[PDB]
Amino acid sequence: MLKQVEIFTDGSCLGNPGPGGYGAILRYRGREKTFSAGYTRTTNNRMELMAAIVALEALKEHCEVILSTDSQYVRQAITQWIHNWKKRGWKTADKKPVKNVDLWQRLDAALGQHQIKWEWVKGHAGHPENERCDELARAAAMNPTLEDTGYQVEV
Numbered sequence: 001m002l003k004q005v006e007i008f009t010d011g012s013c014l015g016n017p018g019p020g021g022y023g024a025i026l027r028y029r030g031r032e033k034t035f036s037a038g039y040t041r042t043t044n045n046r047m048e049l050m051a052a053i054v055a056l057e058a059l060k061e062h063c064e065v066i067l068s069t070d071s072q073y074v075r076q077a078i079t080q081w082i083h084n085w086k087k088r089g090w091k092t093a094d095k096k097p098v099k100n101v102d103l104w105q106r107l108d109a110a111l112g113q114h115q116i117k118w119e120w121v122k123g124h125a126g127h128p129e130n131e132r133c134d135e136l137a138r139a140a141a142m143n144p145t146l147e148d149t150g151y152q153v154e155v
Contacts, residue, residue, distance in 0.1 A: 001030055005065040005114075007055045010133030011047030012141050017151060020047040021140025023133040024055040033058060038140030042148035045073045047137065049103040050148075056110035064115040068130060070123040077104065078118060102150035 006027040013020035021038035035054050039047070048071040056065070069075075077085075082104070090101050098104060121130055 002027055003064070005059060005063040007052070007065060007067045008127070008129040008133050009048070009051030009055060009067065009069045009071070010130065010137040011044055011049070011051050011071065012134065012137035013042060013044035013047055014141055017041040017043055017153075019141045019144045020044065020148075021137045021142075021144075022047045022051040022054070023136025023140065024051045025129050025133060026055050026058055028059065028063075034136070036136040036140050037146055038142070038144040039146045039148040040144040042151050046100055046103060046148055046151060047141075048073050049100060049107055051133075051137075053103065053107050053110055056107070056114070059114065062113055062115075064117075066117045066119055068119040068121055068127065070121050070126055070130060075118075075120050082108070097155055099155070100150070101155075 008025040009022070011020065011022045019038060019040055020042045022036065024035040026033040026035070048069070052067065052069070052074065085098055085104065086108070090098055090105065092098055121127070
């Protein structure tokens, strides 16, 4: 039995927008859950954020999570932006809503219930669980069954 919740996420997209997917692996309680789905039209950044959201929301009590992703998009926002995004009320310098604000808020709500430790691996030097992730991310994109609502060529 693992003392720490462990999450592995990945996201993929064939275009901009194009069919995309995500694969997340959750090591919770004594089980190992596997999430995966593809969306008909979307972006790689929305697929990479979806990975984490869908995984953190499977957790039904306050945990100590360790998250592993090679996503630079998430890294950058967690490391240099998000802090600033709350204080300003989720707005850009030109007073418009940040890109993917719908998912950043959704994720901010999920990150909120837990003790979160981030692990930024390099796309080519991670665990096999990151590889199984990319793999699912890929397969998903090759067969979309859902629609990414909050997607906008826009805002």
